[PDB]
Amino acid sequence: DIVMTQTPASVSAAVGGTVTINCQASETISNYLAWYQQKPGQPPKLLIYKASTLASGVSSRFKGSGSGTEYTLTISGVQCDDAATYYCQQGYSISDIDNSFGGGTEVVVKGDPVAPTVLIFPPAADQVATGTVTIVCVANKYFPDVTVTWEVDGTTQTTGIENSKTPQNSADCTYNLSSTLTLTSTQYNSHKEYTCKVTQGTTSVVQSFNRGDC
Amino acid sequence: QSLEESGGDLVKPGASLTLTCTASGFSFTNNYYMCWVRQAPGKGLEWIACIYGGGRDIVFYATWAKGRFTISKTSSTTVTLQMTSLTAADTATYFCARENFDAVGVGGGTYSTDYYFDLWGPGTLVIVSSGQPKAPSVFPLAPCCGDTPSATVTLGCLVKGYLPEPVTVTWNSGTLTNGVRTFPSVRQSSGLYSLSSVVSVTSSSQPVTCNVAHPATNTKVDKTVAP
Structure with a gap:
């Protein structure tokens, strides 16, 4: 209903590099957008909520930005340790929706x-x-x-x-x-x-x- | 505060199944929604449903879940997910998650928004299949016996034809970890899973034994592998 679209599906960056990931909402979500990191065999972990607020504990290398229907996650000083899948999640509404999560974006780190x-x-x-x-x-x-x-x-x-x-x-x-x-x-x-x-x-x-x- | 899901199992298409999420270190209150989120093998996160932790009965469902799954609080520390008419497409790991929110507006007129998840369980695995449970066959992996030997060698175990997931593999009861490579499982056309694990060993430094556990059939196999 509010559908969230992440692009691209996958992205690459050299170690030390910086990579950006996009999240589009099909209608404004008044900046209620969270980003999660997930590695295989683990539950997702919170990085950012409200589009740009860093979760307690997470590295300042992760920057969320955007407003209205266009949001971005940026990772700086990319380490091999950042290889994982990243998901956005609109937090505007859970009334009459299919899925609050975007489809995810794989991050590949070129060592x-x-x-x-x-x-x-x-x-x-x-x-x-x-x-x-x-x-x-x-x-x-x-x-x-x-x-x-x-x-x-x-x-x-x-x-x-x-x-x-x-x-x-x-x-x-x-x-x-x-x-x-x-x-x-x-x-x-x-x-x-x-x-x-x-x-x-x-x-x-x-x-x-x-x-x-x- | 941690969460722990339980109740995952192998069931047939058409079956029902009830999952339970139990909270430790906190209890359900009007400060949270408790939620379920699933993820099919190799796929994305799918929100399923949320239930309000406070006194009011307020539940939200994904449009694909309402009519087929039910979420309930069965105590101050436990919520369940009752699933009906399951199909192979419901095969997934099912996570319980805690959801924070902002109360906005004024009333009775105030509403919840700014939803995000601040706590997750490790998940419980649900498998929906026609096949019955099956313990794995374990076969040794070694270089062709025709080839000329060599000091340094990599050996392994093939863990084939089990259901449901998971199996776990250690080497020498866990005392060998360096040089170990265990590959993600694959679902074969048969509907049965297989995986392999190999270890690179310096020379005749050790006999290496792979330890394979299949908890769903209460099975543990030790296989000593040599070239």
Whole structure:
């Protein structure tokens, strides 16, 4: 009803840099706007209320501003430790609304580039009798983002793939990624070469194994 | 002052379920609304409902909740959220939150505005699915046995096919933490979750054991992994 729109959905900034996040309301909320920070596995924490008032305890690096229907959160001296999702929340009305929160904005902090260390893990011997086989590839400790490709006997895999990336390391901004390929046991035994390819810009690390040898 | 939600559970589509939020260090008064807020895996915060802490019965609901969820105060330190006709789309972590407000105007004529949340519980997990509970299978992760060994090595455990979340993974009963990387869980097409955890170990410094707990099925698996 009063709908809150945050843009962009994601934003990036170098360490020491400053990033700004916007919150638009579909009608004035007379400056009743709060900002929260949320890291994975935790409840949101209050940063700012009434658009520009710092919550007791929070760093003055966080600045809220704006009025009417346009609001902003600014973060200065961006640290890897600020990587998180930020939400605005209109506090004007809770009568006849869908959601008081905006959709959120991810903040990505660009630290120093690090190339991934890439490992592949063939299935343990007991997996295949379960009727399902699960192959794991990990890209450890890297920035910026990587892309993963799987190949089976030289054919790009296009299904059965699940990727999972950890939050940015609070000290050095890096990610860890796992990529899992799942096949039926019939599919698994009908092929030989299993390949995980991790690409970072113009560099790729390729790890393989052959069903027979494991 | 802290809050603690409870009552999350795995239930089938169509089921009802009641959550409870209990307050410590304060009790409900006309100085606060108590509220519920949810968050589906990988999604945003969604306000659900607020109930006035004072004597008057005043409740507000998100337009998608009124008719299907009910919030009540069951004591000076407990509010519940009764949910009916649940679907997979109601799968989420459910937070209880305390809400501050400004009284504005004069009356009976005064109204609440300037709402913001100043206190949150850790949340309780609700899972709505056709599938029944399932304890995880744990498989070792190690380099191909065909490959030439090496002093320094990373090993792991694959924790596959459990429901509901969560599982927790430690290594060597928690005495190994450096070099440990545990990935967020993924929901597979099957509707079952899986995750992995790997640890980079210097040499034959230790046998490493991953400790996997699945509280929902009262399960703990220790798996000793070697190459």
